[model samples]
Target chain A: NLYFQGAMVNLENKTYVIMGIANKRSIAFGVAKVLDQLGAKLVFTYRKERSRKELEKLLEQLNQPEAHLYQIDVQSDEEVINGFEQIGKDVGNIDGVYHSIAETSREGFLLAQDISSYSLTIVAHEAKKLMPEGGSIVATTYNYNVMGVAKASLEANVKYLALDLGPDNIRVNAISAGNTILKEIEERAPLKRNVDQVEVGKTAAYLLSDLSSGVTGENIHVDS
Target chain B: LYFQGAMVNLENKTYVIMGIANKRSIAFGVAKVLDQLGAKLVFTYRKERSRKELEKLLEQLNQPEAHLYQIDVQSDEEVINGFEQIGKDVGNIDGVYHSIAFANMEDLRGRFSETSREGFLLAQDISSYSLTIVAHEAKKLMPEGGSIVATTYAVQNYNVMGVAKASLEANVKYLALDLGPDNIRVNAISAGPIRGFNTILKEIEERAPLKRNVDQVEVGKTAAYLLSDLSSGVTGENIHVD
Candidate 1:
């Protein structure tokens, strides 16, 4: 379909490898809520064993017996290269991979002062190899007005990935949230009013699922 | 729906009209028609001298309730503070008609190579950057709903202001996507070659398909359509009006 206004999402049998579940109060949690609610069989990937416990608790509340948690730190290229090989071996070419992962050292984020150009080239390079056929790559980023550089490396990388993998039937996109209260969102970014987290989740679901098959190399900003 | 209909009625809607320079400016025609159609009018000027001239033009319209403010888009502090003050004054604004545009008189007619970087950036700063900056501030004030109508030229044709106009087109779509969830629609009306205070109207008229130069009022009517609730579902798109 060229366009989809709204559609019922069946996540029951579909497998989605979700990267970037640091803690419960994470943007990935929002993505997890919508994906899980839609019945998608989610596979959670965290950085290390310490992160798995937190993600495991999130998986427990997800209300799906098929859902499972795994650990694959996105910071290492070897982990991405071998990790996807293992997942493909076990899951047999999953439907999609939501690169919810964002790695920015606190010192890097605070002192770097360049919001648009973040240090995530290797992670993007790794995700480049994991592009599944008919799969969508959903990346989250900071708003464009944060220091006026607005936009994250997740989006910047998705452009190239979308182009390289487009012929393979893979779509790449970014969700722009207005005033999200994550680690980066603070007093500096402009805020009209508080935007609901579920709104962002539903939007992400729309893009990640089959509904947004036509949309690629696009940035959909949700600002209420 | 292709330029034929019983034109929809827009009553009691409020629009902050910007970018009008003089009586020759298309924004002036938009302001006149919108004011006549019962839309509350708000005008902004770049300079006090221009503001005074615009005030005189408003006198001709007999819109006693009209609101005018000084907003030089070049200044970030002015734009931020201006819209905040407008929110306090207007209660809830429903639309914005940004008639703002500029290219150094030297750059518009001469070789594109001669256009300096500072000149290019100056035109873009007022013409393009201000759209995003203002939209952010205005959306905060629009708790209810609103639309923003920005201006641009047909850039893919390689006009002198092409770079600046092209930049404006990008900002139109970018702002549209950024502000969609706010239910605050943003779009641009790329008016066909027309003669105003700056352009050579007579020459453009001879070359145009219509064989006549488009009046500011025609472009203004399109602005009215975009600003009203009629264009609720439309955003991130540009309408070319000849």
Candidate 2:
């Protein structure tokens, strides 16, 4: 579960609604695939026929080819309301809703913020009316919290070295602690354990401090 | 960027960052660390919105005015044009830090054996191949020789993404080999998940030598190492900090 290595995802007979599965690559589809494999009955909501067609083909590959599809665009509160209204009528009580739907536009920039950000509040309000028994409403959020921001800042710092130091013939690099934050470490690491920030920081000091003058575009991990 | 300023040289060197989706991006940790060390930075984004989030994160940096460029690695024309433009505006540079990767989140979750043709190539192209093109362009800018550090990861059970990371590791060897003659070095930082106190981290703390989960700041410190001359003799190698 930590590294998503593999799992026995047995959601057999569970009923759930899946939103926003764009082709096979979208994260929503990934969840959909796993859920399908675990024998979960699925219902998909798409905005356009093209999306529906894509969903149709993807569903064809799954064990639940007859999984229900509904045309629900989150842009209009009324549309979302009507879509879920129909779903409740058709499927009755559902176990959960996987709300992964999102869209953004280049031409209409602010409009994208409206779609990706605000729509969550709108969709949840509507979905709640149907969940009288109270079920899970799982949706995606950007980084979700503050610690997430701290991590991203330092990462930017590494790449910043690349952009700023290059013209002066200066180089920037980093020694990473093998993850974005697993047993993968417990069983696989040379130490038969994971590394800590203090060790990783000390290595960073060496790389950025000119002790590694001959080392340009290199990675040296004390991960072991 | 809790780097402790041990690297006090502050050569005031400059660097470039790619794929900073948000403040949570691993690249940002390095950007934050170097900011304390008098390092300059540039950011490249696939779209204006991608660049927008970096703005808020950049405000946290020592240099808030760091310029950003639009570069979608998916297209050679865009990468070439984008880097060429960077060359025109910024001129020669020291090193490049590439931390971009994507694998249809779908591929990341499903059966590795069922990896679709498009998903395989898609992961390879975006996650691994982009580094090659990025290096090609960077080579042009680093005639005086610079460094290129990319984000690579654990090999086994990494699923489709791992398959691509394998290519990335291979590219490090070749990229280092090809660029070494030019004085430019190429390497990868096989980093770990730098997150907080959680069930997984609890286990990591109990099992790890340090008795703690690695922090983003910690990863950034190492990133600071790779970007600077402290690692001069190393190339075509990967350091794991898990």
Candidate 3:
């Protein structure tokens, strides 16, 4: 039931990076799962070694023990520069990146923006270099926490970054998160339930593929 | 061409006016009205030269005892100490008229997308978060049910300041909610654009239903209404004063 349309979004032979994935329930995992089912190879990066072990188990469960894996902290510049350098060395000419990470609910909302929102800006600078031709960058504008202000910045960044990158054929967008349809969303969102995880993945798949080549700087809210 | 309302007599009341860089400032306009209404004014300035600029403005109004304090919102120590000093100087304030916001010249030009990380965060901090932080401190000075007004504008291809104001308006609602029990009211005025982005000046005059853009004095009057008991029932509202 959680599948894509006909073979239009052929992602085979393409390599992509999943910036943040913790568990099967993580949004990145959902997107990665769709990309996997579509035949695209995955490059998984993490900040923690312990999580690497857990990710290994998840990858095996994903039936993808051969998937590329690396470690990089988006907050650290050295890590990002070196990690992408390593990705270039190993994966070769990857197409897109799924940015599904942000530290939330911290004492300062500014830190939330620094990690969650600004990370995308810096990532785009580096990722654009990787995609000398063109590519897509998909981000998650997730569940709120009054940390909602950060999302405001992220949305603006998306639009501005879109304007900055559109001429280069590198599209920037956000999954205005169909991540949850919990109570409030369930009753309120016209479909009357949370978007199934696969729905979000399919939207992300569209974003990452040439299917959405003409679109940039937009947030597709996967609610209904 | 005006009417009157049951405005509170401001003779015995004191209000703090933040961000009057010149007599032409929105804050100065509000201060002008508040001064005319016989209210005691506590003014905050970031620079010593700005203080003198305001001193001259106040002298023109013939207001000698109006208090002036140096308050740099970017510095937490300065904000806390300055407001604490204001509390010491004036005991209890009736309302706060905040007209503070900033964006780098580059952020407001060329393309909003090219805005620097430093500029974006700086605008968000000074323009948006400063309200939240100041309100937290200002709440202490308003024991009596009070009013708070921030300057905001409807956007038109505006740079990140427009985005920052969206965040700022959100802060108004949240601050209103948290401060409701404490008898503090929060609101903003979406004044017509008078500065940069020139075409709007002509477009508003030719096409807008009102057929004219607004001046700072008009916004000041609206601010006066919000700051007084005239708008006691309003909270978390953004009044468009064009």
Candidate 4:
């Protein structure tokens, strides 16, 4: 008898801090919605005041009962760590954190080698500071032409984070979502269609919640 | 799907077939072959009364009513009872064709090995373990551990079915362990990819060592070989054809 049942994952009143929500169509917004559906209290963050305002305006439409917003410029080392210290003081122990914030030199530097050479590691190290109590962390990357290089960096950062943080029960992972319309790309590879942002969000919600507790230090792909 | 009738008679003989639900069942194809060989056939039904239903179906084929019996392999008592019923209709069971394995579709698709313990036990109970159980019950009737053949797939080593089949192959060995000493031979036909048997690996035809898949008739011929004295020395060994 080699019967198998899916692992049981419980998602109750958990809190997740999501960073990098650009628009209603942002991948972060989709993830927020999935977490919301799973009854998670979400804390949104923005690196700039203007971006914070844009996210606040959109939160009105998210219309969840337990939505809170904060801004902590990730570029500042003190801000990222102190931001969570404040959150811990205010909200107590949080179950997870979703770090979707990614930045590269103004152009497609991450896709190229220029910006990634310095900024990618900088961003990853900063996020590691925010997550003090180990839980679950899901980062995102695009599966496009520069995918090979992007994955190389993403995986390195995720595995390093996973290794250092696993002892503390903090799981770090990355998702390689198939190409989407959010970011413009010239070539349309074999799949003529785009994977919707919400679809990617649902996947993030699963990973962030207890449902994906057993899965750690893994890179996953979601496609239609 | 090809209805090749009465294949490979090398000599005329009969077989007792179990679990023929409808005319579409391969068991009926087996019945056709035995009939063509001019051998008297006995069909076992889950219920003693299904013989009436089988009788109606066989009537069109001109097969005699004496060739049907009620058989329920799930219940150990019923199996013994059913075989006893078959004995009343046919003096000696030349061979027995067991083609019974049922599993829930839900269990077939989801996670592997992490499945519920009940589902695991249920799968083995119905799909594999029962084969050994039946072989034992059938052995009681044939002190010689007469000709016995089982239908299995290579998936027992290829995928999910591969895991299940692995257990089955082990069970084959275990059954052979006990039955072999009694002059009875227990062998299985690890069939090449066949449609409807398992669809998990559709690419099997291209991947099989032969670069081709096998048909039901091919399997039927192999079954005929085990039932015949040609394979007298073979026991507890799986003869695979791809």
Which sections of candidate 4 miss by over 4 Å? Answer: A1-10, A101-133, A143-151, A179-195, B1-242
lDDT of each: 0.65, 0.62, 0.73, 0.59
Window of ten residues with lowest summed lDDT in model 3 chain B: B1-10
Cα miss at B198, model 2 (Å)? 14
Model-by-model DockQ, in order: 0.01, 0.03, 0.01, 0.01
Per-prediction TM-score, chain B alone? 0.80, 0.81, 0.82, 0.70
Best by lDDT: 3
Docking class of 2: incorrect
Question: Which of the numbered candidates is closest to the native, going by highest DockQ?
Answer: 2
lDDT of 4 at A110: 36
Clash pairs of candidate 3? A181-A194
Candidate 3 per-residue C-alpha lDDT over B1-242 given as tens digits, one digit per residue, 9 for 90 to 100: 01111122356778888878886676777787777766788988887878889878987663558688888888899889988998887798888988772322233433444356765777788878888888888888988778899987324444666677789989988988898889888988775321065667766776754334456766666676668654444577665543
- How well does each candidate superpose onto the true structure, as a TM-score? 0.45, 0.47, 0.45, 0.41
lDDT of 4 at A79: 69
DockQ of 1: 0.01
Could you tell me the lDDT of residue B93 within candidate 1? 83
Look at candidate 3 and tell me the lDDT of residue B221.
Answer: 65
Taking chain A of candidate 3, what TM-score results? 0.85
Of 2 and 3, the candidate ranking higher by lDDT:
3
- Interface RMSD, all models, one decimal each? 16.8, 18.1, 27.3, 23.5
